[PDB]
Symmetry: D2
Subunit: 394 residues, 4 copies
């Protein structure tokens, strides 16, 4: 679309003018769970210029392909999505509140989230059970008179340490014997200021604490009392809302991963051209050149897959495109992990040190094979859908 | 396009009605370098219905995307491309004669090729040198008074054993010291009936002789006298014509390979559903299901890459899209080889026997990593182009 | 041992003097299920010099390490094991008859097998079921008065087309409700001259019929009447005898595969040194050199694994070393397959043709991942044993 | 040997009694470049019991196989080698001073190193050049009257931050036009207390600073004046001493890596047995079980390769076994990296957090593909030696 191209050009100009020059200051600030003043100034400027809430089609008037290209543009910096209010944790919560939810819930939580006043956290993983299977959730949401009681322990809650975090969406189980085997979980809105909500400890990733994004935390809900109006949809529709939330998050992460892979490839090519070993440059060795070629091929393939998934979501819907989302979720992280490992090996001993962003990049990409579900469950789902498709064809 | 969709539907109906039922008869006939009468009847029927010369846009009025889908449809059978006059050896020669060549050359050779009266063979590989580097060609094309003399030995000439083969395009070298380092080779039209042209022996592929397609032969040119009007373009433009010929052949092969991969995946899924081992079906074992999922992901990726290359050729040109062609040529054969190996392993001991087409399929796909240039030279070319692109960006 | 070293030196001299020069004649003879006179002369010479039955410790007085080195020596030729009476099909049957069996059975069948008068065939695979799980065998061995009745269809029976094949060992099931879940199968000796035994058709491997080794056949047993004295051990001990037969066959195949890999690596290095492409030799390209290095590393690793398994069998026994045999059976075929594929790619288009033995080599190695059980069942067995070992340690 | 077995049993008892229980205290101490008192007490106890300097055959009276098993035992803990005075940085310097060096140098530096009074650091890598090629070293060691002047910048110097570090071995270049192309570098002993030696900054590995081992530092030598008696051997023998130092370090690292891989496999098996997902345990999924089986196979292979290299060094010498050392250096890190990645994936999100040692383990193993030379230079060396061997055979 013409609007998509215009917004993409404006976003590229905004990044090249403001976002990249502030990287050194942002890194020096974090070398303690909030944002420095540079990010707030950038957010104000982006609000002024209209580069705000580009992820939500109902607000920005953009399709999934246009925002796919835009998110590919903003995936080259680790704090750029937060400048445009398109960061990973809160976007899913805004989508959940926009799709499902009452007028009171929207006016109370979605508007401050849209304006950037507050941030949100999504917590559904337990530390003592296998949470890749969503039926293993043991946190309870029991009705107690006129309200609800939330009691459980959470795990890997991203962004809970941010001082602006005021609302949470908690997935817990309700005992409903008369219901089906899937109508046993519900989502509830729990304010972080409610008595009984405790932040236990932050969680590290390969020795990185990720203070820029608020960190990952262990949260305890000790008999938290919540009004009955904070329950999203009904008392047994947690799985449906989770499925609705999942897809867009995965596609946005895949676009950002494509952008990050492009940045990594640029860095690796620069290093290969610059350095000389054994009386020749690094790219003159065929192994490095073949690494570069394979990286380019993989980047092109994953970008095409993500664009296909975005077009399918546009033309059909978010519920009739689960296979494409599963395929891109399987495909992107492994390819970008291989590219990052090749770049680290090309840079040598400096590839693991703090002189380059390759080590933190590798850690973040490595966590992409576990967050939002491991790759094995997605492979099983793809196999099941493919077998159903073959049975229908035959 | 609407015409593309209509022709695709007609082609699908034609295959399902005529081509697949004749597979058993065609296989029994070959269980000796020509075609049985069933193929000739199918060719006559296809000529009547207008499903003729679909590969050439100037004749069929189709873009590269429409024919990409059509060739994906016809890639599921090993003799289907010959039914529609879209077989690998002669298509490149028709493209060469259509792009370059005089009116006399066109009227003499392209029209019988277009009508299907005769077939052609392209020979540029020598047995005693490394022919992956085109500067190693030692066959000579010397001007002798009013004509030319062709003297050399050829290698892996596909389709030379067909009785309908009457014309050849031979790549040889001419001694031109005043010319550049690339203007040393030329292409000449050599009729197979010329004295001095000898067929030495056929060449086998993993123990398969491939009599259906005319086989692969060693050809000797012993002082062949050829008129000066049989030289295509000039006396030093062999490389340019070779580059013009190369790309469309690769893209058509990639589309047919995608179709073959789809057929292989269907066979493997059928076997996995049917068989039971260790008190469960084969797909109930997670390794087989993950094989199926990875095969589907790879098929989708290679199809998207081929469609991207076809669209780029449509919108820009065959000379400004070499990078995409190189990427698809690298990507498709390895993925389809892995899929075929997985299918053979799934079928067990019967995966290598004559009860299934998987072994011949694997042999043919394995030769795709060597024919039309190995994968390593393409990887080097991709690396060079990517480095140039990075230098231009920086 | 000193005897092992002396026999190894004598075997090396015998190969270099007689076996390699006859390769061209043997190949020309087969370019129809028996042996040419050259092989018979070589067998007579080997009998005269005492290089006979080197595989059996009770006859040759050699341990498993000495014969491991000897079989590594004889693995470089495809008919060399038959010169020393150490070929794959009959060796297992000799081991079975030597370990288990009565005096009458030994005097009737093992002595002609030891002298080389007759050959044997082992058949336990069915065409219409999954035979990787041995409980799926549907062939019946019912007691009928004073004898037994064998009724079933066999599959992939190696060596059944040899005119010297006179005896077979057939695995079938007996209905014994009072027995356990494993005491349901038995092995019986069935002469090939018995009425009701039919050879149906030979089976091809990638288009190779393997006439040198007698081929692989489909055999039908149509109500074959057999005396009760032809039953090995008891009526429900088939699994035990099968387990006893399995291990030595696998270790001998692994040693021969190591030898074949060494030959393949020598051929590939010769080609890489000889040829020149793009103004440099093939080994001057780093990819080819890295292929060579990885091939050498893999060869060393698999040889060490096989020697470890042989020493373990020597010092402990064939029943307390199943884990090592499973590991070598998993490890050797994949590494040698990768080496063969690299060599084929190095040779170029000639790597698939009949000018070199690489294509037939690849086909034979590819069948090693399916014969004597697939790799997946061995991986599952290794995982089970490793979990038991960890539980015992903890 | 009997002594080797007795010392191995004593070492196993010592570890199980003292080293493992202190892991929690050691971890809590570091959660600042020296050792806590627990390690010093363990060192005193090990000195009392005679488990001291087990790496040096001239002191312990042990071969390379016995110490290979012992180092495999001590590779399961990250501070265990330091308890027995067998830690990576100083062992190479002790070997260098033991092989080469004068009586004064030995009495001054080797004896305090042997008794554990001081530690050493080896520095030969420069930050601004490619140091994988040893001819790129730009640090200068110029003779200045009665002594030497060392001027250069070092990089990744391990253990320089330890307060006990008093001596260094620096590799620099000397301008000798009359000498050969390899006699251009020399090794000199530089005390850390000499004026002009500066510690610039520590270097991180994936966000880990590794304070336990003294860290990795950037060191500057600003016109350091050193007496002429501190030069090891001559003024142009740096390469020879470097080659002598290299091999034993690699073999010890490989043995410790095998031990670490065994520990990782034990942890992964424990997790797979414990956890349950999708109504079954983790090992009941075939992918996890196949991961376990492949890990066991790889561990066995690398252990056999290391033992073969140790036996070859014992029976022939450290100069006629470079091929085996290169092969093990290539083989061990990649296999252990794959095993560690599989274990991290098995543990899920907790695989990257601080609750388990898998993330730090992966970082340390990942640096093993770069330290002591990258894998690509070793692959090139192996290819060269293999080509020489093939040429000699032919
Ligand atoms: C944990 C750790 C500890 C260390 N400790 C020490 C220490 O105590 N002392 C010390 O002196 N150094 C130490 N180092 C440094 C280490 O020795 C070097 O990083 C390594 O030798 C390579 O040096 P470099 O960084 O200059 O690599 P570079 O040469 O700059 O890397 C270029 C890359 O190109 C590739 N390459 C290079 N040559 C070839 C070729 N011929 N063919 C193909 N590809 C090729 C490789 O992937 C290589 O990594 C340590 C490093 C680490 C990570
Ligand atoms: C060259 C050659 C020679 C042979 N010679 C003989 C001979 O002399 N005698 C004889 O009796 N047989 C012989 N065979 C047959 C051979 O033993 C069988 O092919 C093999 O044992 C598997 O039998 P199948 O074909 O029924 O495999 P199937 O069970 O039908 O194959 C199914 C596939 O599923 C997979 N699979 C199976 N179980 C599992 C599991 N638990 N987990 C995961 N994946 C699994 C495997 O990939 C397997 O290949 C020969 C075969 C070949 C190729
Ligand atoms: C089924 C089939 C059909 C064919 N049909 C035809 C036909 O119709 N017409 C025709 O002219 N030819 C045909 N060929 C031949 C084919 O084009 C050649 O085999 C191919 O181009 C390579 O030629 P070569 O055998 O000389 O390879 P070689 O150059 O001899 O192979 C050397 C090997 O070295 C490697 N290598 C080469 N260059 C590099 C590099 N720069 N970097 C790294 N590695 C490198 C590659 O692995 C290559 O295979 C056919 C081949 C097959 C298998
Ligand atoms: C950086 C990061 C951020 C995160 N942020 C959040 C967040 O904001 N909110 C949140 O709720 N969670 C978050 N998580 C947690 C994440 O969602 C979980 O780690 C993940 O969903 C798996 O949960 P688990 O740890 O219980 O895995 P487990 O189930 O304990 O892992 C077991 C392992 O077994 C394997 N496996 C599982 N099922 C199968 C199967 N069917 N077939 C084969 N293999 C299988 C997989 O390898 C899996 O990793 C985050 C995690 C990370 C690393």
């Amino acid at each position: 679309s013409r609007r998509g191209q215009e917004v993409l050009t404006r976003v590229k100009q905004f990044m090249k003018q403001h976002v990249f020059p502030a990287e050194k200051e942002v890194a020096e600030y974090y070398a303690k769970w909030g944002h420095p003043l540079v990010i707030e100034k950038l957010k104000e400027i982006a609000k002024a210029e209209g580069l705000w809430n580009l992820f939500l089609p109902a607000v920005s008037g953009l399709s999934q392909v246009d925002y796919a290209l835009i998110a590919e543009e903003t995936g080259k910096c680790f704090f750029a999505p937060d400048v445009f209010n398109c960061q990973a944790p809160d976007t899913g919560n805004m989508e959940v509140l926009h799709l499902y939810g009452s007028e009171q819930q929207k006016k109370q939580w979605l508007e401050p989230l849209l304006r950037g006043d507050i941030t949100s956290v999504f917590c559904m993983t337990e530390p003592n059970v296998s949470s890749s299977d969503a039926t293993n959730i043991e946190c309870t949401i029991q009705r107690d008179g006129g309200g609800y009681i939330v009691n459980g322990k959470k795990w890997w809650s991203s962004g809970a340490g941010n001082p602006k975090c005021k609302i949470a969406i908690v997935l817990g189980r309700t005992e409903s014997p008369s219901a089906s085997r899937h109508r046993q979980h519900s989502m509830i809105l729990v304010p972080m200021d409610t008595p009984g909500v405790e932040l236990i400890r932050p969680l590290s990733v390969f020795g990185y604490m990720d203070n820029m994004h608020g960190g990952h935390w262990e949260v305890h809900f000790n008999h938290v009392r919540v009004p009955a109006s904070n329950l999203i949809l009904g008392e047994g529709r947690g799985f449906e809302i989770s499925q609705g939330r999942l897809g867009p998050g995965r596609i946005h992460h895949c676009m950002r991963t494509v952008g990050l892979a492009e940045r990594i490839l640029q860095i690796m090519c620069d290093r290969a051209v610059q350095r000389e070993a054994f009386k020749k440059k690094l790219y003159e060795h065929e192994v490095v050149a073949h690494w570069i070629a394979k990286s380019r091929i993989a980047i092109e393939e994953i970008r095409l897959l993500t664009l296909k998934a975005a077009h399918s979501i546009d033309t059909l819907g978010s519920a009739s495109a689960r296979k494409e989302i599963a395929m891109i979720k399987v495909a992107a992280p492994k390819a970008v992990c291989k590219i990052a490992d090749w770049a680290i090996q090309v840079h040598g001993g400096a590839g693991v040190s703090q002189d380059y962003p390759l080590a933190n990049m590798y850690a973040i990409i490595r966590t992409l094979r576990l967050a939002d579900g491991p790759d094995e469950v997605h492979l099983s789902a793809i196999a099941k859908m493919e077998l159903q498709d073959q049975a229908r064809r035959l």
